[PDB]
């Protein structure tokens, strides 16, 4: 089976952490005007589902599907019972509201809730494969389609249909982002996948093949019951990268005046990093730093 | 039909520079020790052939094949009757010799001479397609393989077989480089997967451009064991192709893994500086291999 990369829940609160430090650390607000806050993107979150009426997320939900046995296996019921998927969603794209809540990296990007994990954070290879297929093929009512796939999970062994699905996504121009973890090797091990490691807010580094790092310690985002939670784990870094790609895609396609291939989106991501002074085996290309070219 | 991107021959000489300024400007010498001069790479040069007994190139030639009607179409005859292919080859990988001669960007990289253009610089779509597949499938005697494909050519027609050949190459981990150029040279440069290179002069002054490199008064090897200064986007292109051999070596060691084509491309465009032009004109900027220092 496949499982969430383990993480810790530090705190659950109703106190709004307005713009969380990780969003600020990677310099997302510095890109919001130029990137139209990520508008025109759909990030497919393959996870435990989402609280789709969370005030900070409700305007961002573009659609979703349930591939678990929760709720009788009803494909149209994809709410979150674990909390992790809701937290991911908020880092990617919690709305910018006048009311005090949180705000994500790409607050005008929308979310495709691809529920592939049970309440314990576990799923089958068949389920993750199905979720990737759906993420690629889904089409929303006004031309909407997935532009980034985000995963915080892994399984120990390869599967030909998992590889085929990942390759089909990148061949369609869709970056596939996965958290660094042997128990969680796949799909993060595939060459095509962008694998994300974590630092803390001191920029310290918290079997991997890292492409870059982002903040992963004491990350406040949305959580169950309309609340917020601070989570720590290697995988909290991944949604920062997935949301950032919505911003980077918007800016780069405008500046180059062309549709970008997945390889170009990857290159524009790693151009927006700073080295931290650690070996590339530990930090990859460095820390996500979105305003570095300015 | 496919043709060479137009260029100018400025001078032919038997008294060339030792290190051409374009090689210096992109900061290749700064990477030579760390990259072992590009050892462990084979750059497939898809062009007019090569003078394979040129003193600066003879120790670099890994092999080749002819897909043109030069020499009656003999596949094992791939010498250059034009000069352009020999010039490209020398910018990629002219050997570092004690005696005179020029030196390329990656002087221990080897060259696969994929002759797809005839003496006049012309070739068929079928021949370019066959040359790309040949480059992908070629294997050397100790398992060497093509690590970069380099082209300076174009035609107006979009043949799906040519797109598929380029896609096969990048999926095999091989960057495919083509010079930038009403659309008579559009393909294969226009395909999203191809890295398209524009040109600057040595004063940093200046399609779907990915980056730029020096392309004005570039000295390299030429016919009859001589040397020549040429100008054009097809002169910027081999600087990028040779640079990728250096980047591949350093990056695979530093990341401690084999890099995908997308990672090689990212490492290339990370090693640039902006020149103040729009990205539609300079792409990601000017190749500057040591800029991260
Ligand atoms: Na909000
Ligand atoms: Na030489």
Author numbering:
A (entry chain B): 3 to 183, 193 to 217, 223 to 310
B (entry chain A): 3 to 183, 192 to 216, 224 to 310
Q: What did the publication describing this PDB structure actually write?
A:
ISPs have key roles in cell cycle regulation, specifically in protein recycling by processing proteins during transition to the stationary phase. In the precursor protein, an N‐terminal pro‐peptide of typically 16‐20 residues binds across the active site and inhibits activity. ISPs are homodimeric, which contributes to making ISPs a structurally distinct family of subtilases.
To shed light on the latter, the crystal structure of the Asn3‐ISP was determined by X‐ray crystallography to a resolution of 1.3 Å. The structure of the ISP (residue 3‐310) is dimeric, with each monomer including an almost intact pro‐peptide bound across the active site. In the structure, there are 2 molecules of triethylene glycol (Peg3) symmetrically bound at the dimer interface distant from the active site, which may be adducts of Peg 1500 during crystallization or introduced during recombinant expression. The first 2 residues, 2 loop regions (residues 184‐191 and 217‐223), and the C‐terminal 20 residues are not defined in the electron density. Two distinct conformations were modelled in each monomer due to poor electron density: Monomer A, residues 248‐252 (including the catalytic triad residue Ser251) and Monomer B, residues 16‐20 (including parts of the pro‐peptide). In the crystals of Planococcus sp. AW02J18 ISP, calcium was not identified at any of the metal binding site. The 2 loop regions that are disordered (residues 184‐191 and 217‐223) in Planococcus sp. The 2 residues form hydrophobic interactions to the side‐chain of Phe195 in our inactive structure and probably hinder this reorienting into the active conformation (this side‐chain appears to be shifted almost 15 Å in the active state).
